[PDB]
Design a protein around this ligand. Structure first.
Ligand SMILES: *[C@@H]1O[C@H](CO)[C@@H](O[C@@H]2O[C@H](CO)[C@@H](O[C@@H]3O[C@H](CO[C@H]4O[C@H](CO[C@H]5O[C@H](CO)[C@@H](O)[C@H](O)[C@@H]5O)[C@@H](O)[C@H](O)[C@@H]4O)[C@@H](O)[C@H](O[C@H]4O[C@H](CO)[C@@H](O)[C@H](O)[C@@H]4O[C@H]4O[C@H](CO)[C@@H](O)[C@H](O)[C@@H]4O)[C@@H]3O)[C@H](O)[C@H]2NC(C)=O)[C@H](O)[C@H]1NC(C)=O
Ligand SMILES: *[C@@H]1O[C@H](CO)[C@@H](O[C@@H]2O[C@H](CO)[C@@H](O[C@@H]3O[C@H](CO[C@H]4O[C@H](CO)[C@@H](O)[C@H](O[C@H]5O[C@H](CO)[C@@H](O)[C@H](O)[C@@H]5O)[C@@H]4O)[C@@H](O)[C@H](O)[C@@H]3O)[C@H](O)[C@H]2NC(C)=O)[C@H](O)[C@H]1NC(C)=O
Ligand SMILES: *[C@@H]1O[C@H](CO)[C@@H](O[C@@H]2O[C@H](CO)[C@@H](O[C@@H]3O[C@H](CO[C@H]4O[C@H](CO)[C@@H](O)[C@H](O[C@H]5O[C@H](CO)[C@@H](O)[C@H](O)[C@@H]5O)[C@@H]4O)[C@@H](O)[C@H](O)[C@@H]3O)[C@H](O)[C@H]2NC(C)=O)[C@H](O)[C@H]1NC(C)=O
Ligand SMILES: *[C@@H]1O[C@H](CO[C@@H]2O[C@@H](C)[C@@H](O)[C@@H](O)[C@@H]2O)[C@@H](O[C@@H]2O[C@H](CO)[C@@H](O[C@@H]3O[C@H](CO)[C@@H](O)[C@H](O)[C@@H]3O)[C@H](O)[C@H]2NC(C)=O)[C@H](O)[C@H]1NC(C)=O
Ligand SMILES: *[C@@H]1O[C@H](CO[C@@H]2O[C@@H](C)[C@@H](O)[C@@H](O)[C@@H]2O)[C@@H](O[C@@H]2O[C@H](CO)[C@@H](O[C@@H]3O[C@H](CO)[C@@H](O)[C@H](O)[C@@H]3O)[C@H](O)[C@H]2NC(C)=O)[C@H](O)[C@H]1NC(C)=O
Ligand SMILES: *[C@@H]1O[C@H](CO[C@@H]2O[C@@H](C)[C@@H](O)[C@@H](O)[C@@H]2O)[C@@H](O[C@@H]2O[C@H](CO)[C@@H](O[C@@H]3O[C@H](CO)[C@@H](O)[C@H](O)[C@@H]3O)[C@H](O)[C@H]2NC(C)=O)[C@H](O)[C@H]1NC(C)=O
Ligand SMILES: *[C@@H]1O[C@H](CO)[C@@H](O[C@@H]2O[C@H](CO)[C@@H](O[C@@H]3O[C@H](CO)[C@@H](O)[C@H](O)[C@@H]3O)[C@H](O)[C@H]2NC(C)=O)[C@H](O)[C@H]1NC(C)=O
Ligand SMILES: *[C@@H]1O[C@H](CO[C@@H]2O[C@@H](C)[C@@H](O)[C@@H](O)[C@@H]2O)[C@@H](O[C@@H]2O[C@H](CO)[C@@H](O)[C@H](O)[C@H]2NC(C)=O)[C@H](O)[C@H]1NC(C)=O
Ligand SMILES: *[C@@H]1O[C@H](CO[C@@H]2O[C@@H](C)[C@@H](O)[C@@H](O)[C@@H]2O)[C@@H](O[C@@H]2O[C@H](CO)[C@@H](O)[C@H](O)[C@H]2NC(C)=O)[C@H](O)[C@H]1NC(C)=O
Ligand SMILES: *[C@@H]1O[C@H](CO[C@@H]2O[C@@H](C)[C@@H](O)[C@@H](O)[C@@H]2O)[C@@H](O[C@@H]2O[C@H](CO)[C@@H](O)[C@H](O)[C@H]2NC(C)=O)[C@H](O)[C@H]1NC(C)=O
Ligand SMILES: *[C@@H]1O[C@H](CO)[C@@H](O[C@@H]2O[C@H](CO)[C@@H](O)[C@H](O)[C@H]2NC(C)=O)[C@H](O)[C@H]1NC(C)=O
Ligand SMILES: *[C@@H]1O[C@H](CO)[C@@H](O[C@@H]2O[C@H](CO)[C@@H](O)[C@H](O)[C@H]2NC(C)=O)[C@H](O)[C@H]1NC(C)=O
Ligand SMILES: *[C@@H]1O[C@H](CO[C@@H]2O[C@@H](C)[C@@H](O)[C@@H](O)[C@@H]2O)[C@@H](O)[C@H](O)[C@H]1NC(C)=O
Ligand SMILES: *[C@@H]1O[C@H](CO[C@@H]2O[C@@H](C)[C@@H](O)[C@@H](O)[C@@H]2O)[C@@H](O)[C@H](O)[C@H]1NC(C)=O
Ligand SMILES: *[C@@H]1O[C@H](CO[C@@H]2O[C@@H](C)[C@@H](O)[C@@H](O)[C@@H]2O)[C@@H](O)[C@H](O)[C@H]1NC(C)=O
Lengths: 126, 449, 116, 126, 126, 48, 48
């Protein structure tokens, strides 16, 4: 089943994880008044690579899905697993989590790949 | 115990704005003629304008704060000068003009002048003595026979859009880049504000002719079911109110005079296209509109106003108040020429509760400052012969009166003149957002050590 | 700074017509509403209308409509106002005022009258 | 042995897999009439990142080589392994496969990393 | 402890490996006289993706750290492990190694991912 | 060092008449021409 | 005291104060600006 770009938005997040290969595939989309069109398409690769930068500095860099060793503070939208993925859309959800996003991100980039990746060489030197 | 988990390409978007880009399709691109109106560098339209619907999405739409209008507002003005700059500058045309009331047999109480003036040629030394016929609105006298001079001479440097470039509105599809998109609000009865029930995303708008016009909208989109009433705030009389028809209305606009274009050499490479003497009958511009569908239109409209205002009340139409001629009258380009028409008898009515057509007088003005920007004017060269253009009326702009008498009668007249309202006609259903493909939500998952 | 400067006091016969100007300076002229208010001696304020300098958009009130001709010269930055069919009841002191918040793009207001 | 950029083109594909680090290394290459040179070098990163996008949405994202769980339809250039890598150049080959490329790509981006990567979290939640 | 961007520069390299998530996080930073600002921010993604290209063609592509199967020639700054990471700053160090960098890089892009990654398919075909 | 790298077993069909590099060179010389003349002296008054 | 090379007299030498110094600059004449019309759209602001 292919619902296209942004099809599962209003759908619950658990149902929205099936379109990740869609929304990430068209995300990059492959004189006067000619300047109008040119500056528009530049902002895509900045928005794309910024995620790639964030995805890279975190423990992911792999596309469409990821996990982390950072726990979920119950102070961040305390809810059951079904109250989140099954009961909430990505619109309703990211509304709640926009609070702690960078607080979350700080541990992903630092407590993980600044730490867990330093653990590599110390284990990989011997 | 929950953790954090990153998901790339999630259906999370946020509202933002950026620069859009045009689509003129390919058919009006072939109009060419050395940059006909807009289309020059314009990107082609999608052959299959894919429209994808999104479900369970409640999105709040605002057409009045929509940013896509201000862009369209500025581009048309810049693109305007982009034609005039390679075109012929008429700044030397500011000159003392010896003119006469045009030749006719009395029965007046003119407006056209036989204007003899001393001009210059391509050879810088020798000069020129020429005559041309001008409408009264482009000149003004100065105080033997009366002498006249152009109206812009004391204001703004005048140019002339070269006859190659046309003014013809060409449908334009505004498009968005990657990481963004455009949303179309399709629900039939929609007032433009609040939430939009029917939300569908597209990468380009429909065909939008950037019609440069006032008091009336032509060739645009039609509404559905009841004629829709859209206003940002209706309690404020000052804020303009826009309407959208479910039924298009026919109009035949003509310049019946058969014009001659005198091309006179101001060069090298410069030259000026003047107006020659009319050939035969002296008539004046006008446009016809059916009175029958008109009367029924006002009946179908007045039934829609009685949902928002009163169940049974009185509704009166009256002609405009005052302002520039570009407001008080109806401006638009008919094929090469900009017509300004008297709208009075359309609005001569009083309505309460429960075979022929009409005609309107019109005037043509060549020198045009439109969008009021001073320091730069423009001259529209005359078009040879009888001009005819047929237009289909898809929209309206109106204003309200004032306290007057308590719960008695409301009066309505023409309005607008800010072309941002012209672009709101096709942009009411549109708005822009931006994607946040990264998201963090808890689950039992955790990465490795 | 900004300034609103009007014409001089006039003495006329009844039934005639009278024009009054206002000349603004020190700001963006084409983008700022101009109110007009007459005050009869000892009376309160009587609002006679307004003119948007942008293309000349005007709106008057009910009781003053048809005797009031209000224009502006955007070149020379001079607002105008006219009253005809002069009656002894039309003798008053006439003001011009600007609304608080203006611009060349978006708009609002109603309430504001600052420069008088 | 270093034959430079695009050296193995006319050579058979099996012989052309040794230059992948060459053709991918220089692929990014690290007023009027000045506009002439500027717009040219922009198209490289779009062509580069589009592959990175395709390589990313598929099961690869790793450079120079990759495989997939998508089978080869015999309707796609039915040939023996030696009739392909040993007997055909990348020019002669990609000529044949330009047919089903996106048909192939659709399963790489969707049947694989939209599917196999969803299998991760379901296995990684416990 | 967060010392900010480029905090550990003068510090020894062993102490400078803790900031890698900092210097790599802000490395992408997420008419006339308007041209002045626009051409400046373009050079970041070229400098960023060139490293991503180098990091990609080598055996890394993973951010902030990496190793290789290429040995260290004693002709490259012959020093003990403590004479390098503990006794030398990245400024003093990269001063010495700017000599053989590309000589090193040549084996990372070719002797490794042109070679070791070809070993994959030959082992992964069966 | 205008590096020239040869490719082997490559049969490529060449057309100089449909080659697009010409039209570019055709236009640049004309634009660059005016780019000189625009700051230069306009002789339009010389018509006498 | 900052200079690129002080042995060369030709090279300029730059100084920086620790104490700012006050100065009051005035044009005491009361000027008139005559705006004369050279247009359309052009005009020249003269001295009265
Ligand atoms: C080193 O640094 C120092 C300090 O930073 C520099 O010193 C500066 O010197 C400038 C001149 O060289 C001088 O510039 C003038 O500033 C005037 C003040 O503008 C402010 O105030 C006015 C009015 O406010 C006053 O009154 C109110 C209310 O009563 C009080 O609250 C205020 O405190 C003031 O007393 C405001 O309107 C402004 O918004 C500012 O807030 C300006 O008025 C003046 O501009 C006038 O002349 C301009 C040149 O022709 C003209 O373009 C402009 O329109 C102004 O014209 C006046 O008169 C016309 C008449 O028609 C009228 O239409 C206008 O509306 C206006 O009234 C100058 O800009 C600086 O003030 C002074 N200080 C600072 C902090 O900058 C020093 O120059 C610098 N050295 C070098 C080499 O750079
Ligand atoms: C006022 O004007 C408006 C807009 O011009 C009229 O509103 C409707 O306009 C739409 C199109 O914008 C018409 O609806 C559909 O148009 C579809 C597109 O048709 C074009 O492309 C087709 C395929 O590429 C092509 O076949 C077609 O040619 C047809 O018309 C040609 C003449 O224009 C004719 O020469 C050909 O032989 C052929 O018949 C077009 O190029 C089309 O595919 C759909 O079938 C459908 O027609 C509406 O019909 C227009 N009318 C209405 C009532 O909705 C509006 O009518 C005008 N109002 C008045 C009062 O005149
Ligand atoms: C010659 O000029 C120079 C520079 O103009 C003077 O040098 C010093 O200038 C600095 C500022 O550049 C002053 O030092 C600090 O300024 C800080 C910034 O203050 C501004 O922003 C504040 C917060 O946003 C704001 O509160 C403050 O307003 C204050 O001053 C206003 C008038 O300017 C006044 O209306 C307000 O009420 C309020 O008092 C400013 O907008 C400030 O935060 C610091 O506290 C500090 O002041 C120095 O004081 C300047 N002076 C010196 C001696 O260092 C230099 O003095 C001048 N020399 C001579 C001889 O005149
Ligand atoms: C963490 O999230 C909270 C709460 O957010 C709440 O839930 C969301 C789903 C939305 O519906 C929010 O609208 C809702 O508040 C954020 O709460 C913030 O609280 C402060 C007060 O402590 C609010 O300040 C208000 O400011 C207005 C305007 O001046 C006043 O009238 C109010 O009296 C009050 O002072 C603030 O609006 C509110 N929201 C935000 C976005 O700040 C909290 O900020 C957020 N923290 C982080 C880091 O995101
Ligand atoms: C899958 O591949 C086939 C076959 O391709 C064949 O082998 C290649 C190595 C090349 O040498 C091709 O030139 C060769 O055909 C594609 O075949 C397509 O078949 C249709 C007919 O079914 C061809 O249409 C022709 O159109 C011309 C011009 O009007 C007519 O004169 C012919 O009579 C005939 O109708 C078509 O040219 C041909 N090639 C292409 C590129 O379409 C097939 O399209 C392709 N499928 C996909 C999805 O790529
Ligand atoms: C490998 O590294 C060496 C040595 O670098 C030395 O140590 C560094 C930490 C720095 O302090 C360097 O300044 C220092 O030399 C490089 O040595 C190079 O040697 C040649 C001579 O064989 C030097 O040439 C000099 O040229 C000057 C100017 O003409 C003459 O006056 C000298 O007499 C001498 O001929 C050269 O300057 C020096 N440095 C460089 C950067 O070339 C060596 O080049 C380097 N190899 C590589 C591949 O990087
Ligand atoms: C053609 O040019 C002539 C040049 O004068 C214009 O004639 C003028 O017309 C006006 C009417 O609008 C005359 O004014 C009238 O004066 C009489 C007598 O006092 C008065 O009773 C009327 O109420 C009105 O004020 C004016 O006198 C007349 N000029 C002359 C010299 O007689 C004429 O209007 C031009 N035609 C057009 C279409 O402009
Ligand atoms: C749109 O969503 C509805 C259900 O959304 C529910 O209500 C929201 C307010 C929010 O609380 C969500 O978490 C809820 O799940 C979907 O309706 C379901 O449809 C399926 C299949 O048709 C059916 O089996 C379920 O019983 C329905 N559930 C409910 C509560 O009606 C609907 O399918 C979604 N749209 C699409 C296209 O899937
Ligand atoms: C260029 O290719 C030839 C062989 O190409 C063959 O013919 C083609 C039409 C196509 O069918 C290919 O698949 C074929 O392999 C190479 O010639 C070989 O050279 C090696 C070493 O010199 C020799 O051992 C083989 O016997 C040769 N094979 C044949 C058939 O002649 C040639 O080497 C290639 N060029 C380069 C630079 O390697
Ligand atoms: C800055 O560096 C000093 C030490 O640098 C030493 O000298 C250099 C020339 C080079 O040879 C380096 O490799 C040397 O390590 C740091 O001083 C140390 O500070 C810690 C904690 O304060 C203390 O325990 C050590 O004994 C100090 N070592 C010495 C030799 O003094 C200093 O801390 C560095 N700056 C910062 C902010 O860490
Ligand atoms: C436009 O229509 C909407 C309904 O589609 C009106 O309803 C408002 O909806 C918002 C939700 O965002 C509520 O917060 C308001 O309270 C609603 N108001 C009313 C009166 O229903 C909206 O009012 C309409 N706006 C206009 C100007 O007519
Ligand atoms: C406007 O002019 C068009 C023609 O230019 C008129 O169209 C005619 O309409 C009648 C029916 O009313 C048809 O029988 C004719 O065949 C149409 N002719 C053409 C050429 O289309 C239209 O009626 C006119 N409308 C008005 C209000 O005058
Ligand atoms: C959960 O979060 C609690 C609150 O943290 C504070 O508020 C947030 C919004 C940030 O501003 C953060 O910097 C603040 O410290 C913490 O007090 C608590 O320790 C956290 N618990 C866990 C397990 O993370
Ligand atoms: C092999 O391919 C057969 C043909 O598929 C059809 O043609 C190609 C070009 C595409 O257009 C595709 O969408 C069509 O369905 C299939 O019928 C067959 O099932 C395929 N078999 C396997 C194992 O993939
Ligand atoms: C160590 O390096 C020695 C020197 O290599 C030569 O010099 C460097 C700077 C490069 O220019 C390189 O191309 C030269 O060949 C080698 O002779 C020696 O074999 C190397 N040993 C190892 C183990 O790599």
């Amino acid at each position: 089943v292919f619902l296209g770009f942004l099809g599962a938005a209003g759908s619950t997040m658990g149902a929205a994880s099936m379109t990740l290969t869609v929304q990430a595939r068209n995300l990059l989309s492959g004189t006067v008044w000619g300047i109008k069109q040119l500056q528009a398409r530049v902002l895509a690769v900045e928005r794309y690579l910024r995620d790639q930068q964030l995805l890279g500095i975190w423990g992911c860099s792999g596309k469409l899905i990821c996990c982390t060793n950072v726990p979920w503070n119950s102070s961040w939208s305390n809810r059951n697993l079904s109250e989140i993925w099954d009961n909430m859309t990505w619109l309703q959800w990211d509304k709640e989590i926009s609070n702690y996003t960078q607080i979350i991100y700080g541990l992903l980039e630092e407590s993980q790949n600044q730490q867990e990746k330093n653990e590599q060489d110390l284990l990989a030197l011997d | 115990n929950l953790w954090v988990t990153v998901y790339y390409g999630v259906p999370v978007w946020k509202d933002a704005e950026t620069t859009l880009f045009c689509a003129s399709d390919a058919k009006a691109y072939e109009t060419e003629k050395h940059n006909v109106w807009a289309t020059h560098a314009c990107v082609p339209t999608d052959p299959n304008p894919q429209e994808i619907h999104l479900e369970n999405v409640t999105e709040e739409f605002n057409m009045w704060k929509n940013n896509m209008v201000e862009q369209m507002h500025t581009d048309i003005i810049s693109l305007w000068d982009q034609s005039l700059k390679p075109c012929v500058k008429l700044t030397p045309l500011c000159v003392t003009l010896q003119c006469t009331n045009v030749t006719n047999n009395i029965t007046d109480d003119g407006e056209l002048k036989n204007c003899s003036f001393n001009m210059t040629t391509e050879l810088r030394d020798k000069k020129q003595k020429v005559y041309s016929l001008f409408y009264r609105l482009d000149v003004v006298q100065i105080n033997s026979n009366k002498e006249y001079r152009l109206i812009n001479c004391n204001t703004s440097a005048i140019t002339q859009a070269c006859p190659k470039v046309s003014f013809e509105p060409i449908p334009i599809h505004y498009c968005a880049p990657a990481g963004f998109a455009i949303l179309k609000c399709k629900d039939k009865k929609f007032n433009g504000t609040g939430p939009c029930p029917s939300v569908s995303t597209v990468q380009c708008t429909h065909g939008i002719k950037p019609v440069v016009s006032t008091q009336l909208l032509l060739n645009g989109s039609l509404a559905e079911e009841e004629v829709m009433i859209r206003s940002e705030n209706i309690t404020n009389n000052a804020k303009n109110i826009l309407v959208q028809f479910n039924t298009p209305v026919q109009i035949n606009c003509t310049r019946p005079n058969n014009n001659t274009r005198k091309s006179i050499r101001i060069g090298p490479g410069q030259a000026f296209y003047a107006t020659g003497d009319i050939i035969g009958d002296i008539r004046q511009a006008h446009c016809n509109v059916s009175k029958a569908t008109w009367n029924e239109t006002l009946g179908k409209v007045v039934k829609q106003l009685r949902k928002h205002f009163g169940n049974n009340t009185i509704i009166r139409f009256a002609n405009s108040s005052g302002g520039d001629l570009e407001v008080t009258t109806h401006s638009f380009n008919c094929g090469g020429e900009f017509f300004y028409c008297n709208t009075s008898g359309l609005f001569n009515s009083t309505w309460i509760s429960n075979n022929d057509s009409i005609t309107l007088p019109c005037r043509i003005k060549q020198i045009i400052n439109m969008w009021q920007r001073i320091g730069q004017a423009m001259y529209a060269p005359p078009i040879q012969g009888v001009i005819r253009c047929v237009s289909n009326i898809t929209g309206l702009i109106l204003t309200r009166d004032g306290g007057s008498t308590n719960s008695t009668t409301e009066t309505f007249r023409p309005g607008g003149g800010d072309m941002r309202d012209n672009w709101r006609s096709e942009l009411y259903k549109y708005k822009v957002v931006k994607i946040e493909p990264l998201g963090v939500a808890p689950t039992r998952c955790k990465r490795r050590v | 700074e900004v300034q609103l400067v009007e014409s001089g006091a006039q003495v006329k016969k009844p039934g005639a017509s009278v024009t009054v100007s206002c000349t603004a300076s020190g700001y963006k002229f084409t983008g700022y509403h101009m109110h007009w208010v007459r005050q009869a001696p000892g009376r309160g304020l009587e609002w006679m209308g307004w003119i948007n300098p942008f293309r000349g958009a005007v709106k008057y009130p009910q009781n003053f409509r048809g005797r009031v001709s209000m224009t502006r010269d955007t070149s020379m930055e001079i607002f105008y106002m006219e009253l005809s069919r002069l009656t002894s009841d039309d003798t008053a002191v006439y003001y011009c005022a600007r609304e608080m918040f203006d611009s060349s793009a978006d708009w609002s207001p109603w309430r504001g009258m600052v420069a008088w």
